[PDB]
Amino acid sequence: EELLDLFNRQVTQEFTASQVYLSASIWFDQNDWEGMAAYMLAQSAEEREHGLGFVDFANKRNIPIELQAVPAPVSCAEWSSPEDVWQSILELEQANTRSLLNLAEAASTCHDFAVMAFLNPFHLQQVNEEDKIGSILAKVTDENRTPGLLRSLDVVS
Amino acid sequence: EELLDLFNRQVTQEFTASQVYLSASIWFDQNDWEGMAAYMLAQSAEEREHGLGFVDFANKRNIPIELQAVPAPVSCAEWSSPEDVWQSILELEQANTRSLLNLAEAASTCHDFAVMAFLNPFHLQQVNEEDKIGSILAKVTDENRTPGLLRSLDVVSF
Amino acid sequence: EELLDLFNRQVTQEFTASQVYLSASIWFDQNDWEGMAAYMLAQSAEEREHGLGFVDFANKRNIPIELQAVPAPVSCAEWSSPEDVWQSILELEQANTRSLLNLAEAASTCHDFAVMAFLNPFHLQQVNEEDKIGSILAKVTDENRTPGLLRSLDVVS
Amino acid sequence: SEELLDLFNRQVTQEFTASQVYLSASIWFDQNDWEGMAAYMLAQSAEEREHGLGFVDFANKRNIPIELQAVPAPVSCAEWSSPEDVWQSILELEQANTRSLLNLAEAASTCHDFAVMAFLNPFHLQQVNEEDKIGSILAKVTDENRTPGLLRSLDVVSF
Amino acid sequence: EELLDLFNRQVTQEFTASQVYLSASIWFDQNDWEGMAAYMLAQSAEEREHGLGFVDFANKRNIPIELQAVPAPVSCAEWSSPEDVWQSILELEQANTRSLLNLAEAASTCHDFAVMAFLNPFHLQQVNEEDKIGSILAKVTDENRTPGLLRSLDVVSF
Ligand SMILES: [Fe+3]
Ligand SMILES: [Fe+3]
Ligand SMILES: [Fe+3]
Ligand SMILES: [Fe+3]
Ligand SMILES: [Fe+3]
Ligand SMILES: [Fe+3]
Ligand SMILES: [Fe+3]
Numbered sequence: 001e002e003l004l005d006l007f008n009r010q011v012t013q014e015f016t017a018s019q020v021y022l023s024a025s026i027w028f029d030q031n032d033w034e035g036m037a038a039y040m041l042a043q044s045a046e047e048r049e050h051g052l053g054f055v056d057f058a059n060k061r062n063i064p065i066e067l068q069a070v071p072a073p074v075s076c077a078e079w080s081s082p083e084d085v086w087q088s089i090l091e092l093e094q095a096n097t098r099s100l101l102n103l104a105e106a107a108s109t110c111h112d113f114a115v116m117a118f119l120n121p122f123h124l125q126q127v128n129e130e131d132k133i134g135s136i137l138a139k140v141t142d143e144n145r146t147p148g149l150l151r152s153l154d155v156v157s
Numbered sequence: 158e159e160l161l162d163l164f165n166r167q168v169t170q171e172f173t174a175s176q177v178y179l180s181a182s183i184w185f186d187q188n189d190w191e192g193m194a195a196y197m198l199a200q201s202a203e204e205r206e207h208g209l210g211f212v213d214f215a216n217k218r219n220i221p222i223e224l225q226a227v228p229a230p231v232s233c234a235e236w237s238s239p240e241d242v243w244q245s246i247l248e249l250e251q252a253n254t255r256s257l258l259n260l261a262e263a264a265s266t267c268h269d270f271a272v273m274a275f276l277n278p279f280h281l282q283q284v285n286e287e288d289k290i291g292s293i294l295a296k297v298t299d300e301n302r303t304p305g306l307l308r309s310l311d312v313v314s315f
Numbered sequence: 316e317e318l319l320d321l322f323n324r325q326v327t328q329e330f331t332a333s334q335v336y337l338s339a340s341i342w343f344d345q346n347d348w349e350g351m352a353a354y355m356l357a358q359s360a361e362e363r364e365h366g367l368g369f370v371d372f373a374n375k376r377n378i379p380i381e382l383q384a385v386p387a388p389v390s391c392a393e394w395s396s397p398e399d400v401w402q403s404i405l406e407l408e409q410a411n412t413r414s415l416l417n418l419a420e421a422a423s424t425c426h427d428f429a430v431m432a433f434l435n436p437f438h439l440q441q442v443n444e445e446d447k448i449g450s451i452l453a454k455v456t457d458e459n460r461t462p463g464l465l466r467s468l469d470v471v472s
Numbered sequence: 473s474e475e476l477l478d479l480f481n482r483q484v485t486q487e488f489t490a491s492q493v494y495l496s497a498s499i500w501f502d503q504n505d506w507e508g509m510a511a512y513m514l515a516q517s518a519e520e521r522e523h524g525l526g527f528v529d530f531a532n533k534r535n536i537p538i539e540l541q542a543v544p545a546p547v548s549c550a551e552w553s554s555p556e557d558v559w560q561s562i563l564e565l566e567q568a569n570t571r572s573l574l575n576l577a578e579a580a581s582t583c584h585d586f587a588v589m590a591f592l593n594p595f596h597l598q599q600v601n602e603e604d605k606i607g608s609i610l611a612k613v614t615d616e617n618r619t620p621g622l623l624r625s626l627d628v629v630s631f
Numbered sequence: 632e633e634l635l636d637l638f639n640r641q642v643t644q645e646f647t648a649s650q651v652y653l654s655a656s657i658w659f660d661q662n663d664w665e666g667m668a669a670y671m672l673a674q675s676a677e678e679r680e681h682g683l684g685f686v687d688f689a690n691k692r693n694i695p696i697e698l699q700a701v702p703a704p705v706s707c708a709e710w711s712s713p714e715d716v717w718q719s720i721l722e723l724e725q726a727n728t729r730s731l732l733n734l735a736e737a738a739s740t741c742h743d744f745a746v747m748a749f750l751n752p753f754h755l756q757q758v759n760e761e762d763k764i765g766s767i768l769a770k771v772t773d774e775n776r777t778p779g780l781l782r783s784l785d786v787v788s789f
């Protein structure tokens with residue numbers, strides 16, 4: 001099934017996202033943006049929890065899960081400012097949203113009511129997440145127009 | 158209307174299931190499996206509560222309900238061991254699930270978004286119920302391989 | 316620097332172990348061993364925490380970290396009983412122990428006192444972990460000599 | 473009362489000897505992953521040492537000279553190959569512990585040593601309880617070990 | 632013997648560091664950076680506590696201590712901005728780190744396991760201290776690129 005394979009790929013996408021966020025925390029910590037680093041660490045953990053929630057449902061529903069490699073994050077080689085990092089995180093959340101939507105489309109096709117119900121809170125959370133990351137990126141982009149200004153607002157926490 | 162008939166039938170199915178669970182409690186109690194009996198009795202009440210939830214929604218949404226007979230459970234006559242009981246209960250939940258999924262299909266066909274929304278927690282509850290029942294059944298089947306060992310699932314656990 | 320390369324590989328090893336524990340949880344859950352599944356799930360989280368610890372230390376000490384792929388867990392495909400799973404986990408912990416000891420050796424050669432100090436609690440944790448896993452494996456191997464009896468370990472402990 | 477003073481001194485040795493045999497049993501059980509039985513033996517080891525300390529305290533107070541002897545190496549641990557073997561040795565140890573205290577009380581009685589006899593009473597009653605408890609466990613172990621793996625239940629649950 | 636010398640020098644280095652931090656507080660206070668001043672004063676007290684810890688250990692281990700002069704701080708004659716102060720304090724911690732590592736190599740050579748164990752928490756504290764000072768210096772150097780902005784760090788953090 002399309003639905004089985006896609007359900008597995010969703011697990012992989014959550015854990016990939018978790019590792020991309022961790023990469024982002026490392027870039028931030030290495031460049032002394034400790035606040036932004038903490039934010040990314042927290043998000044890394046929450047994406048892994050999403051992945052675990054998908055594994056749990058799959059196990060219950062007898063959807064076979066085979067854990068795939070979690071690829072090495074690559075965007076961290078090109079980041080040179082906070083803006084770059086937040087833009088890559090926005091793109092990551094857009095891609096997490098598209099993958100949930102593909103999954104839901106396959107479930108809709110299959111008349112898989114339980115899967116569609118399972119996905120609903122993640123659809124709504126993805127709305128919130130893309131909105132939050134978008135908002136931060138807009139703030140970052142504005143503040144960084146003045147030297148030092150952005151730093152003064154990582155310091156928060 | 159098909160949606161309406163299937164909504165009525167769903168009430169029947171929940172009450173049917175409640176009675177099959179009661180039947181299972183009886184067989185266990187009669188055979189001194191008081192733990193498994195308690196589990197079945199609790200599930201009997203819960204099934205009945207599901208029925209009642211369907212009745213309440215129906216009443217709100219002006220879906221006419223006419224209570225049907227609650228058929229007599231038939232599988233107890235055959236049961237010989239706890240394995241046979243838990244297997245019949247798994248089959249009952251699998252049928253509870255197919256019934257909900259058919260009602261959801263009818264609702265989808267009719268664009269009845271309210272009914273589809275109302276069913277969603279039931280869809281997810283059935284996933285959990287089939288998993289839990291399947292798990293117990295696997296334990297029962299394994300433990301019963303050694304004489305008397307299953308009598309420790311009951312007394313210890315449950 | 317061997318030291319810096321080994322410190323990076325230790326992060327990958329912690330995350331690899333996290334994913335192998337998750338694969339153990341899955342096999343247990345799929346096979347209705349919910350007790351053992353939960354044990355594996357918890358140990359998965361803890362191994363990730365260890366990896367996070369090494370990342371944080373590295374950031375503070377200016378050891379550059381580049382996240383590597385976390386390879387797909389392999390042992391899963393061939394597990395057939397709980398004994399097989401627990402045996403693979405013991406072998407993982409034994410490997411986890413050797414990796415830390417090799418890192419410590421490289422640190423000792425370099426006179427890297429800070430890294431040696433950082434590693435001390437992990438050395439002692441591994442002793443505890445290998446002991447605990449070996450002890451569960453011995454119980455599983457003994458109990459599984461009687462059909463169904465091991466299904467008792469799970470339900471109780 | 474040279475006999476008495478002697479046997480009292482040696483009773484300290486006997487308690488500490490028993491403490492070490494319990495410790496040995498704890499080690500055998502830990503090394504073989506019976507952590508439940510191991511903990512029980514470790515606790516009994518501490519308690520036998522306390523009994524010895526009680527004998528020493530009483531002797532100091534009653535001007536009975538104490539000279540601490542070597543505590544012999546435990547040797548039953550070489551032969552042990554199952555829990556049954558361990559618990560049988562521990563039963564034998566307690567039965568020996570009881571005989572040693574009765575011989576001490578016999579010597580006190582002969583000497584009209586009312587204080588020592590009073591001091592020993594709670595110990596005579598404790599040994600009754602200890603031999604019963606150990607005998608009961610050994611009976612359980614012996615029965616459960618008739619089915620492979622089943623004794624691992626005793627450990628994991630109880631203890 | 633060299634361990635004994637290096638262990639006395641370590642006490643000296645901690646007290647010398649204490650005084651340098653005190654100098655940094657004075658410079659900040661005089662220049663109305665009261666937040667940075669209080670941070671430096673806190674670090675001054677803490678470096679003195681570390682020296683006292685070394686003294687206590689030495690007394691216990693019969694390592695004879697003879698207290699050396701605390702030299703007059705001199706970096707404070709040349710500081711013109713907060714960045715210059717923080718840079719000096721980074722160099723200070725880097726030298727405190729070096730002195731601990733020298734001492735640990737000497738204990739290692741002598742197989743002095745007690746000394747090496749005593750040092751372990753200090754090795755890890757120095758990693759944290761250099762990281763923290765490094766991070767503050769990065770923030771100061773960035774924020775000082777806009778006139779007046781660094782006054783924001785002083786009031787907000789610290
Ligand atoms: Fe996600
Ligand atoms: Fe996301
Ligand atoms: Fe139901
Ligand atoms: Fe680990
Ligand atoms: Fe581990
Ligand atoms: Fe005793
Ligand atoms: Fe005794």
Ligand SMILES: [Fe+3]
Binds near residue numbers: 645648678681
């Ligand atoms: Fe210091």
Ligand SMILES: [Fe+3]
Binds near residue numbers: 648678724760
């Ligand atoms: Fe310092």
